[PDB]
């Protein structure tokens, strides 16, 4: 959130937070009930999303389900369906916090090489989040589609 950007920004310069960020703190804290229109409409519509994007991935790139792929067995596909709603959980942490600080330190720092420790390649899993964005933004209303769209958009850049 915005508040841990400011305290960790004012500790090493040894100074109180000035008005340039205290106006920036108070502007985030009046937008909670605007952001809470987005966070529950992702929440109870989770299972509608989680396989509408999962069918969207394999109709676009079927090699993770192809024999010799990654989720060719059911114990991998049960893992990979779980990771969508894990990514839908941490994205909704970011829309609540309004920043990057939960979405950094849970599911984004170091994923570029620790999928490579597993079998799953990187840029197909970039396609999994990009189809998950349009599976969620079609469910979202349009005037608040543009607010939650950069939070999905950061995961595309940081993973690829």
């Amino acid at each position: 959130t915005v508040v841990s950007q400011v305290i960790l920004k004012a500790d090493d310069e040894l100074r109180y937070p000035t008005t340039g960020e205290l106006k920036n703190i108070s502007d985030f804290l009046k937008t909670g009930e605007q952001r809470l229109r987005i966070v529950d409409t992702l929440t109870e519509n989770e299972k509608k999303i989680v396989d509408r994007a999962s069918a969207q991935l394999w109709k676009k790139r079927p090699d993770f389900i192809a024999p010799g792929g990654n989720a060719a067995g059911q114990r991998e596909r049960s893992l990979c369906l779980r990771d969508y709603g894990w990514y839908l959980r941490v994205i909704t942490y970011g829309i609540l916090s309004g920043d990057k600080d939960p979405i950094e330190s849970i599911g984004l720092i170091g994923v570029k090489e620790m999928y490579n420790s597993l079998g799953v390649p990187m840029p197909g899993m970039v396609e999994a989040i990009r189809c998950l964005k349009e599976a969620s933004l079609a469910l979202l209303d349009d005037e608040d589609a543009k607010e939650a769209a950069p939070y999905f958009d950061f995961i595309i850049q940081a993973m690829s």
């Binding site: 000035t18 008005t19 804290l29 942490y93």
Partner: protein, 161 residues
Amino acid sequence: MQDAITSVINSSDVQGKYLDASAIQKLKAYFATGELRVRAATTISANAANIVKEAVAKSLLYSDITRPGGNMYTTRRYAACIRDLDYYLRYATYAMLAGDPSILDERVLNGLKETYNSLGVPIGATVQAIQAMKEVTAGLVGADAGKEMGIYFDYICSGLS
């Protein structure tokens, strides 16, 4: 560093579930008190050389401690003592801005209890100076936000004693 926003992120993430109703009742309480805490953090920083002055001029000057013999006789002890009381007030306002005392657990109460007995610093006098600094601060910001520092001023005094 754990904000009260990020504290209920982490307590929801250790269960791996989404935000429930009782978690959101911590956020919507915290989103309600946003403008109150920002008004307090301005007027402390405009008075942070006077809150640190009227705390020590009330409780510690002309005492045993400013007199020759104990712990604030020389000027370098006085400069070190006003360095602490400035730093307690500067670290109390972050917990007022966060709404969580995890700043005080991480950045203040780590080595401080061990290094005061190791230096011969009277804990019983510096638990009183922060206690004297509370009702200066509760008068300087207004008693609605004066009941907000009292959690985080005495979180130091709960840890340092």
